[PDB]
Amino acid sequence: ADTIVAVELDTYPNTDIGDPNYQHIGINIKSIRSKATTRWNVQDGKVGTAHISYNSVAKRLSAIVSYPGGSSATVSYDVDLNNILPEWVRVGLSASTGLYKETNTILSWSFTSKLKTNSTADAQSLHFTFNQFSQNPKDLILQGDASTDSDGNLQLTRVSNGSPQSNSVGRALYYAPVHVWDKSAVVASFDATFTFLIKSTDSDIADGIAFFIANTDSSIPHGSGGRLLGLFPDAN
Amino acid sequence: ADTIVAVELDTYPNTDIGDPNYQHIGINIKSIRSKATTRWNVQDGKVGTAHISYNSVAKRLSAIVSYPGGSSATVSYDVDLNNILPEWVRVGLSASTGLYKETNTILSWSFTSKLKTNSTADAQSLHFTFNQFSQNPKDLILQGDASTDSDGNLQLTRVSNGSPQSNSVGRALYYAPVHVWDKSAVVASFDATFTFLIKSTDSDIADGIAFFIANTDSSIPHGSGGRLLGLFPDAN
Amino acid sequence: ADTIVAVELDTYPNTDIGDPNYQHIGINIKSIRSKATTRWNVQDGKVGTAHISYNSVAKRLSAIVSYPGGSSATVSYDVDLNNILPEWVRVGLSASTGLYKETNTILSWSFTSKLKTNSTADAQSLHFTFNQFSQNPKDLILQGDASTDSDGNLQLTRVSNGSPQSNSVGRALYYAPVHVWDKSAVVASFDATFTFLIKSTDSDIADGIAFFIANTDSSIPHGSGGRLLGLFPDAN
Amino acid sequence: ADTIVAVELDTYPNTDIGDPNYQHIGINIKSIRSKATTRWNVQDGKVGTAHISYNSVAKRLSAIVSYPGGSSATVSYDVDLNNILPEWVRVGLSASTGLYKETNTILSWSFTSKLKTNSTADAQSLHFTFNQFSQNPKDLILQGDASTDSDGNLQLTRVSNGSPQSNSVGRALYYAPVHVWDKSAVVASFDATFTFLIKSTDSDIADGIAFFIANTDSSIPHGSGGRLLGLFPDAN
Ligand SMILES: [Ca+2]
Ligand SMILES: [Ca+2]
Ligand SMILES: [Ca+2]
Ligand SMILES: [Ca+2]
Ligand SMILES: [Mn+2]
Ligand SMILES: [Mn+2]
Ligand SMILES: [Mn+2]
Ligand SMILES: [Mn+2]
Numbered sequence: 001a002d003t004i005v006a007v008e009l010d011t012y013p014n015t016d017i018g019d020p021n022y023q024h025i026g027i028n029i030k031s032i033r034s035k036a037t038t039r040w041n042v043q044d045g046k047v048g049t050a051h052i053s054y055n056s057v058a059k060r061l062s063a064i065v066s067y068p069g070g071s072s073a074t075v076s077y078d079v080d081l082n083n084i085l086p087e088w089v090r091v092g093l094s095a096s097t098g099l100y101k102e103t104n105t106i107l108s109w110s111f112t113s114k115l116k117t118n119s120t121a122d123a124q125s126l127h128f129t130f131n132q133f134s135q136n137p138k139d140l141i142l143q144g145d146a147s148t149d150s151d152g153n154l155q156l157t158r159v160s161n162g163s164p165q166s167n168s169v170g171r172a173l174y175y176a177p178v179h180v181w182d183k184s185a186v187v188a189s190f191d192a193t194f195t196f197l198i199k200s201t202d203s204d205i206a207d208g209i210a211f212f213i214a215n216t217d218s219s220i221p222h223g224s225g226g227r228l229l230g231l232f233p234d235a236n
Numbered sequence: 237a238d239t240i241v242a243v244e245l246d247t248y249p250n251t252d253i254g255d256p257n258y259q260h261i262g263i264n265i266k267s268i269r270s271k272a273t274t275r276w277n278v279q280d281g282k283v284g285t286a287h288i289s290y291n292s293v294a295k296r297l298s299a300i301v302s303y304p305g306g307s308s309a310t311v312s313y314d315v316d317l318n319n320i321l322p323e324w325v326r327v328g329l330s331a332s333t334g335l336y337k338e339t340n341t342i343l344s345w346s347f348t349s350k351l352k353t354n355s356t357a358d359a360q361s362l363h364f365t366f367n368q369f370s371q372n373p374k375d376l377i378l379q380g381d382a383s384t385d386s387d388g389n390l391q392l393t394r395v396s397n398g399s400p401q402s403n404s405v406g407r408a409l410y411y412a413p414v415h416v417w418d419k420s421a422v423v424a425s426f427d428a429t430f431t432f433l434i435k436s437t438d439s440d441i442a443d444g445i446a447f448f449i450a451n452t453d454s455s456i457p458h459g460s461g462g463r464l465l466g467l468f469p470d471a472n
Numbered sequence: 473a474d475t476i477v478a479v480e481l482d483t484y485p486n487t488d489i490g491d492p493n494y495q496h497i498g499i500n501i502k503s504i505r506s507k508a509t510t511r512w513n514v515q516d517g518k519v520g521t522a523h524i525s526y527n528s529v530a531k532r533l534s535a536i537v538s539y540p541g542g543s544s545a546t547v548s549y550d551v552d553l554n555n556i557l558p559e560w561v562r563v564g565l566s567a568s569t570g571l572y573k574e575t576n577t578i579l580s581w582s583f584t585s586k587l588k589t590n591s592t593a594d595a596q597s598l599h600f601t602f603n604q605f606s607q608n609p610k611d612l613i614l615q616g617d618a619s620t621d622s623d624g625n626l627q628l629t630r631v632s633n634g635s636p637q638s639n640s641v642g643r644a645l646y647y648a649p650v651h652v653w654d655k656s657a658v659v660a661s662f663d664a665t666f667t668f669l670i671k672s673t674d675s676d677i678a679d680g681i682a683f684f685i686a687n688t689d690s691s692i693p694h695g696s697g698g699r700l701l702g703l704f705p706d707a708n
Numbered sequence: 709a710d711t712i713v714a715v716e717l718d719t720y721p722n723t724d725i726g727d728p729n730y731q732h733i734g735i736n737i738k739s740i741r742s743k744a745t746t747r748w749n750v751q752d753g754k755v756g757t758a759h760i761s762y763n764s765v766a767k768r769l770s771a772i773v774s775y776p777g778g779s780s781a782t783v784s785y786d787v788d789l790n791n792i793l794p795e796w797v798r799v800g801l802s803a804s805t806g807l808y809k810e811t812n813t814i815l816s817w818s819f820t821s822k823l824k825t826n827s828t829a830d831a832q833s834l835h836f837t838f839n840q841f842s843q844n845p846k847d848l849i850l851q852g853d854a855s856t857d858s859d860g861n862l863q864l865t866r867v868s869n870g871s872p873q874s875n876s877v878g879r880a881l882y883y884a885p886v887h888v889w890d891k892s893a894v895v896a897s898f899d900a901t902f903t904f905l906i907k908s909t910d911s912d913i914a915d916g917i918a919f920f921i922a923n924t925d926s927s928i929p930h931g932s933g934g935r936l937l938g939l940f941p942d943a944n
Binding site: 088119121122123124125126127128129130131132134138139152174175176177178179182216 | 795796825827829830831832833834835836837838839840842845846847860882883884885886887890892924
C-alpha cells in the first residue's frame with residue numbers, strides 16, 4: 001500500500017463514494033474520499049490551469065484551478081504533511097477514464113521544492129519545468145497508458161486519432177525523488193502548476209486528472225481504474 | 237498613513253502596548269499591536285534565520301525563525317492580504333534600539349514574489365538575493381542609520397568599532413516596487429528569508445528587527461523609534 | 473556621455489553609418505557601429521524571440537533571434553564587459569521609428585543577473601520576468617513614447633489606433649539597478665529574453681529594437697531617433 | 709561506450725598521458741587528454757569553488773576554480789556540444805586516488821539546465837541545489853566508493869575517519885536524466901557550481917575531481933582508476 005497525497009480535478013460525480021453531486025476539485029489525504037471539495041465547472045475543450053501550494057510552516061495545502069475568462073474554483077485543507085509523507089517522495093500526474101471518457105492532456109507542468117534550515121541558500125531544492133514533453137521523455141516514469149504525442153503534449157490516458165478511449169489509466173512521475181523532509185529540517189515547501197485539456201465530443205465525461213505525491217516506488221494500484229483515478233486500490 | 241504588514245522579531249517586551257511579557261516573534265497588520273505572537277528566545281551572538289511566506293489562495297501569512305542546533309519559533313496569521321496592501325508595494329527590513337541596544341546585523345536577504353494567470357509562466361515575477369551587501373548598494377533605499385559595513389553586512393542600526401549605539405533606527409527597502417496583486421490575477425505569492433545577528437555585551441537588549449511590506453513611498457514615521465521598530469507613528 | 477552595451481534588431485540598413493546592406497542583428501559596444509553583425513530576416517507580423525547571453529569567464533556575449541518554424545540568426549562578440557560597464561547599471565529595451573515606421577511591440581521580457589563568489593549561493597541575484605505589462609508599470613522607468621497598451625503589451629514606439637507612427641523613440645528600463653560587477657566577484661553573468669512583434673502596412677520598415685545595459689541614470693540622448701535606436705547621441 | 713564531457717581538477721601531473729607538468733584544470737571532450745588546460749594551484753586543506761558554464765549560441769564551455777583571498781584559475785574551449793552529446797545525459801561528479809591520495813569532498817553542488825524555443829518561459833528546465841547531502845541521498849546515483857558522511861558532506865573517494873584512502877574511485881550522478889537537446893530546440897544552456905575539499909597530510913596528492921556529463925546509463929568504466937578519474941577506460 002502506497003501513501004498518497006493528491007489534488008483531484010474530478011470530472012464525474014461518484015456520489016456512492018462520497019463525491020459531491022457535481023464536478024469538483026478535491027484534496028486527498030490517503031483516500032479517494034477528499035478531505036475537502038469545491039464545486040468546479042469543467043469547460044469542455046478549453047485549456048485549464050491549476051496551481052498547488054504547500055508550506056510546512058503554514059501547514060495548509062491549497063489548489064486553485066481556472067480557465068481563461070476567469071472562472072476559477074479553489075480548495076484548501078489544514079494538514080501537517082510532515083507526518084503523513086515519507087522523507088523522500090515522488091511527484092506526479094495521473095488521470096483515468098472508465099465507462100465515460102475524456103482526453104486527459106497535460107500541456108505543461110512545473111514543480112518547485114525546497115528544504116531548508118539555517119540560511120537563504122537552503123540545504124535542498126529542485127525545480128523543473130515542462131512547457132512541452134519530448135517523444136521519449138527520459139526524466140518521466142510513465143505508467144499504464146501514459147505517453148507523449150507528436151504535438152509535444154502528454155496524454156495520460158489512451159487517445160486514438162485524437163479520440164479518447166474507455167477504461168484507461170496513466171501516470172507520469174518525475175524521475176528524481178524529491179527530498180521533502182529531514183531530521184534537521186526547518187521548513188519544507190512545494191509548488192506545482194500544470195495546464196490541461198479535458199475534451200470530449202460526448203458530454204458525460206470521466207474520470208479526472210490528479211496531481212499527486214507518493215512514496216518513491218509508487219505504481220498504479222491494482223483496481224485503481226475509473227473513479228479511483230489511478231491512485232487508490234479501493235474506495236477508501 | 238503608511239500601510240504596513242510586518243513580521244517582527246521583538247527582543248524587548250513592552251506590555252503597555254500589547255506585547256507578551258517575554259521575547260516573541262509576531263505578525264503585524266497595520267499596527268504595532270500584533271495580531272499573533274509566539275514566544276521566541278534570542279540567542280545572543282548567534283546567527284539566526286527567518287523564513288516568511290504567503291500565498292493568496294491559502295491566505296495564511298506565516299514566519300519561522302530558527303537558530304542552529306534545533307531551537308525555533310513559528311507564528312502564523314490568517315489574513316487576506318488583498319484587503320490590506322496596495323497592489324504595488326516596496327519590501328524592506330527595519331530595526332531599532334532605544335535606551336537599551338543590540339547590533340541588528342543582516343547577513344543575507346532573499347525575496348521571491350510571483351503573480352499568476354493561466355500558464356506555468358508568471359504574468360510577473362521578481363526574485364532578488366543578497367548574501368553580501370556591497371559598500372554602496374544602489375538597489376537598496378537606505379533610511380535612517382542603515383548602512384552596509386566593510387565585512388559586507390547590513391547594519392540597520394548604528395555601530396562603532398563593534399559596539400551598538402542607543403536610539404538608532406534604520407531601514408533598507410528593495411529599490412524596485414513589487415506588484416503583489418492585480419484583480420486580473422489568479423494567485424499571488426511571496427517568500428522571504430533573512431539571516432541576522434543580534435548581539436550585546438549588555439544584559440538587557442532592545443528593540444528588535446522586522447521584515448515589512450509597505451506602500452512604495454514609505455519612510456520612517458516620526459517617532460517610530462524604540463518599541464515602534466521604525467514602522468509605526470504611534471502605538472495604535 | 474552614456475555608456476552602452478546593446479544587442480540590436482536593426483530593421484533598416486543605414487549603410488552611411490556602417491550597417492551592412494540588409495536587416496541584421498548587432499552587438500553594440502559604446503557605438504551604433506556594431507562590433508559584429510549577422511543577416512537577420514524580419515518576418516513582418518510574426519512574434520519573434522531574442523535570447524541574450526553573457527558570462528565573465530567565457531567573455532563572449534551572444535544573441536540569437538528566431539521565429540516559429542526554424543528561422544533564426546545568431547551573433548557573438550568576444551569582449552570583457554568588466555572593463556566597459558560600471559559596477560552598477562540598469563537594463564532596458566529601446567525602439568525607434570524615423571521616416572519609415574514599424575510597431576516595436578514587446579510581449580514578454582525576462583532578465584537574470586548573477587554575481588558569484590565561493591558558494592553555491594550567489595553574492596547577488598536579480599531575476600525578473602514580465603509576461604504582460606500592467607497599465608501603470610511602477611517597476612519600469614518609461615522614457616519617451618514608450619507606454620503599455622490595453623492588451624498588456626509594451627509599445628516602445630507610438631501607435632495610433634492600431635497603426636505605428638514615424639519619428640518615435642521609446643525605452644523601458646527596469647527600476648532596480650543591477651549589480652553587474654564587484655571586485656570580490658569571481659563570476660558575473662546575465663541572460664535576457666524578450667519576445668517582440670514587428671508589424672507594418674508599408675513595405676519599407678525602420679528602425680529596430682535593442683536590448684541594452686547602461687549606466688544607472690541613462691536617458692534618451694538628444695537626436696537619437698531613427699537609425700540611432702534611442703541609444704547614442706552621434707553615429708561615431 | 710560512455711560519451712564523456714568533463715571539467716577536471718587535476719591534482720597530479722601524469723605528463724606521459726598529455727597532462728601538463730603542474731596541477732591544472734582542464735576541459736575534457738571524450739578523452740582524458742584535455743582539449744584545454746590552465747595551471748591551477750591546489751590549496752591543501754582549503755574549501756574551493758568551481759563554476760562551469762555552457763551556452764549553445766556562444767559555443768564556449770568554460771570553468772573557473774577559485775579559493776578565498778583571490779586565487780582563481782580559468783580554462784575554456786570552443787566547442788559545439790550539440791553534436792558531441794546525446795539528446796539525454798546524466799550529470800555528475802567523479803574522482804579518484806592512486807598511490808598518492810587526498811580527500812575528494814563535495815560540500816555543495818548545484819546545476820541548471822535550459823531548453824529554449826520561442827517564449828520567455830522555455831520548453832524544458834531543470835535545477836537542483838545541494839548545500840548538504842542526506843544520509844541516504846535517494847536523488848543521487850552513488851557509484852564506486854562514493855558515499856555521504858555524517859557532516860552532510862559527499863565523499864567521492866574512500867576516507868577512513870578524517871583520512872583519505874588509496875586507490876579509490878567514486879562518482880555521484882543526479883537521478884533524473886537531463887534534456888540537453890531537442891530538434892525544436894533553439895538554445896540549450898547549462899551552469900554548474902560545486903565547492904570541494906582536497907586535503908592530505910602528505911605533500912604529493914592524487915588524483916582529482918571532475919564535473920562530467922555522460923550518457924544516461926554511464927557507470928565507472930573498467931580500469932578507470934587513478935589518473936583516468938573514473939571517467940575513461942583508457943588514456944586515448
Ligand atoms: Ca469522481
Ligand atoms: Ca517590543
Ligand atoms: Ca539601422
Ligand atoms: Ca592527472
Ligand atoms: Mn472526488
Ligand atoms: Mn511585539
Ligand atoms: Mn545596425
Ligand atoms: Mn589532466
